[PDB]
Homo-oligomer: A and B are copies of this chain.
Amino acid sequence: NPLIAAASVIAAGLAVGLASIGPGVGQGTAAGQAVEGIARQPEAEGKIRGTLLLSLAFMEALTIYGLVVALALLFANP
């Protein structure tokens, strides 16, 4: 049990570096697709960011979901 449930929480813990994969790709496109847009009409800048950030927010949200459960299995393990 402390042999397994220990080592387990560990293995299973870090198998929440998948929370990087999905978003990592995503948000990075949003950023990319915004930075060019701004390049075109720079007086529209901000009107861009406001969403980028808005979006960029909860790309990063569902990675922390893991980082939460990553540490909640590690240092909050039951």
B-side contacts of A55, CB under 8 Å: 27-28, 30-32, 34-35, 52, 56
Copies in the complex: 14
A59 pairs with B8, CB closer than 8 A: no
- Name the prevailing secondary structure of the A interface residues: helix
B-side contacts of A2, CB under 8 Å: 1, 5
A66 to B74, alpha carbons, bound, how many Å?
A: 13
Q: Which residue of the partner chain, among B3, B14, B15, B26, contacts A26 with CB atoms under 8 Å?
A: B26
A40 pairs with B39, CB closer than 8 A: yes
A69 pairs with B33, CB closer than 8 A: no
Chain A residues with CB under 8 Å of chain B are 1-45, 47-56, 58-75, 77-78
